[PDB]
Write a protein that binds this ligand. Structure first.
Ligand SMILES: *[C@H](O)[C@H](C[C@@H]1CCNC1=O)NC(=O)[C@H](CC(C)C)NC(=O)OCc1ccccc1
Ligand SMILES: *[C@H](O)[C@H](C[C@@H]1CCNC1=O)NC(=O)[C@H](CC(C)C)NC(=O)OCc1ccccc1
Lengths: 306, 306
């Protein structure tokens, strides 16, 4: 037993990280088949980035201005192009270590693993949630751009995120691998505005279910509640509204625990109005919202990939 | 910026996980060169495990009773032997994906990444600390035995932990890869006693330094303290005593922040006596102690492996 924030095994993605250089900017790219993907601001200098005209900047570049390195061996750029905020470099060699993969645009509230990279070299892996306001709470330094977020189902790697920028708020913003930002963000060095962040209610419930599965059962109470009775309390506390579709997603967890979902909502309601009184749940003094119901079921049994 | 609990990239270790079967028990083994390492209780039935005579149980086994599988391909056992609580299976083929590696016995307070495995197949990765009482707070289900904990320096994998058992307390116990348990534990299914756990003071300070590096600076105060003045407060709160060698380990973090270490101890003293007053530090309502000073410096800049 036990419950930990768990990332996917990163081996399949490690083999796809390369270094992309152009000017003095170096960052990470993703090498799949004969195409390298990286953030398009690799083509900016430090002055460009305040309001870059990316089309005019890319025009001044040719294939040989793009140095791509995988370890110490290397590809040549036989073509380049811009798709939204990513650059695609067509290269000599198809990556021999290309995993089965898809590109997916994930939804707010879903989680993924981030392989943090510097100079094309993997550095660490951790789990993140796409916040309701389309930011992530990451760990990214200069050079980290082009690090990717992914899920593994099967032997199949679903890439969902490429890192581009840190907002002066301290949280992080990026694109899908077609180069479209999550959220309202643009790739320029300007003060940019994330919305109010809300707590992912269905994730908090799933973690309360994980807590019961693991012996933490004190918060379980006497009360019950209705869906709209709870949703009134949810908006008081900036929790995203709970729907019937959320209830049904929790069905498996409800059936393994024998605790009805709105029995679980009633415990959550009192935690929100009464606090935790200095006690803890799965070793945390806060309500955790970065576990999806699938994360919980995975970890609590299943938990197996090619 | 930002600060997250980060595991090492797991690719090098994924290639070493195999399935070891003997009877109906299946668990994970580690395949390095032509030797497979796994917990010796793979040779027990469900009745043996209450007080197994491992030597007498191993004698009834021969090489062909040990089914070792790496993916779907497979090795033959040309020799077996017991070293402390691990079985070593000499096998046909040297693992083509063997990384450069060493076996190390880590010290209390150090951290490592755990690659959780089931049926020889990697499932997830997360970071753990060896507690002062030689347990870890893990996430392990049935079948997880033989999963390993490791560090990466270089391209060099330092294996330090193999998982064996869950204590009725809920925390986890295991051996080094020479088969010697961390702590007083034995591999039998008996109620077993971990000591009082203490908080790793030097790790908490390192995380407070990480907090200051990342903008969380409210806890920084006015006071100072002496080493033994702090150590009196530390034993009140079951914190391990702070020594001069701990101070010097924190030197780098002190010099990047400009905050003297016993200036940092004074802030920690007031957190311990006054609580956090419902505020948070790096998004946590508790004092975190599973980051070493090296973890902090790694993540806060460096953070790069083969
Ligand atoms: C790409 O490597 C970099 C990632 C930033 C670096 C600091 N923390 C991150 O997540 N992205 C940028 O530098 C980005 C470039 C624009 C053209 C998109 N600008 C940016 O994110 O400004 C925020 C910032 C810059 C430098 C240090 C701290 C924050
Ligand atoms: C090895 O796969 C297994 C790992 C346990 C399984 C449950 N959570 C774990 O960490 N180890 C054992 O089953 C161990 C065998 C002895 C001969 C060492 N016995 C044990 O740990 O008992 C505790 C336990 C057993 C089953 C479920 C929950 C706890």
């Amino acid at each position: 037993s036990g419950f930990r924030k768990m990332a996917f095994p990163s081996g399949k993605v490690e083999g796809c990280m390369v270094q992309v250089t152009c000017g003095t900017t170096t960052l990470n790219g993703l090498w799949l088949d004969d195409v390298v993907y990286c953030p398009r601001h690799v083509i900016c200098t430090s002055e460009d980035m305040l309001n870059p005209n990316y089309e005019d900047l890319l025009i001044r570049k040719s294939n040989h201005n793009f140095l791509v390195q995988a370890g110490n061996v290397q590809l040549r750029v036989i073509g380049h192009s811009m798709q939204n905020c990513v650059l695609k470099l067509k290269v000599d060699t198809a990556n021999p270590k290309t995993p089965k993969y898809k590109f997916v645009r994930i939804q707010p509230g879903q989680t993924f693993s981030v392989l943090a990279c510097y100079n094309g070299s993997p550095s660490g892996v951790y789990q993140c949630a796409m916040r309701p306001n389309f930011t992530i709470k990451g760990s990214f330094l200069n050079g980290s751009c082009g690090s990717v977020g992914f899920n593994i189902d099967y032997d199949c790697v679903s890439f969902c995120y490429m890192h581009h920028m840190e907002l002066p708020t301290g949280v992080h913003a990026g694109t899908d691998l077609e180069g479209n930002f999550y959220g309202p963000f643009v790739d320029r060095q300007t003060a940019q505005a994330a919305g109010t962040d809300t707590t992912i209610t269905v994730n908090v419930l799933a973690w309360l279910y994980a807590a019961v599965i693991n012996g933490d059962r004190w918060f379980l109470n006497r009360f019950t509640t209705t869906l709209n009775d709870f949703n009134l309390v949810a908006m008081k506390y900036n929790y995203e509204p709970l729907t019937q579709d959320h209830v049904d997603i929790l069905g498996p967890l409800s059936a393994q625990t024998g605790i009805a979902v709105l029995d679980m909502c009633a415990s959550l309601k009192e935690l929100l109005q009464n606090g935790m009184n200095g006690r803890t749940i799965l070793g945390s003094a806060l309500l955790e919202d970065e576990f999806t119901p699938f994360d919980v079921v995975r970890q609590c049994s299943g938990v197996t990939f090619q």
